[PDB]
Amino acid sequence: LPFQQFGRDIADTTDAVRDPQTLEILDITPCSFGGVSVITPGTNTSNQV
Amino acid sequence: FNGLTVLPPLLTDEMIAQYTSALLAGTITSGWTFGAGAALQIPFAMQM
Numbered sequence A: 001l002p003f004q005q006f007g008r009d010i011a012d013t014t015d016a017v018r019d020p021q022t023l024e025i026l027d028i029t030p031c032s033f034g035g036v037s038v039i040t041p042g043t044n045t046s047n048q049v
Numbered sequence B: 001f002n003g004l005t006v007l008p009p010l011l012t013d014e015m016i017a018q019y020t021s022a023l024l025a026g027t028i029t030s031g032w033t034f035g036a037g038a039a040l041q042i043p044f045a046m047q048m
């Protein structure tokens, strides 16, 4: 709506915004993240992973 | 999005369903003999 400028979704973090100069609505998404795991057969057998 | 991740389980639902079907088919065809050792066939009325 015209008076609204931000968006907070369910939690307190902002997920949408309004560009001041062009009055456009932009969705914001977090950058990619995740864990990294190493599968080894054992140093005794080999050194490949 | 705050470092919270959900990991998938090792056994998919199809694998668990296959286990259940193997147990139930073994029961209705061999009785209780497949638990002790090799499965041995017996007609159902005789088992009951």
Ligand SMILES: *[C@@H]1O[C@H](CO)[C@@H](O)[C@H](O)[C@H]1NC(C)=O
Pocket (backbone or CB within 6 Å): A020, A021, A022
């Ligand atoms: C300046 O901002 C207004 C919105 O506040 C916009 O409509 C206008 O086109 C902008 N002009 C420039 C110089 O970009």
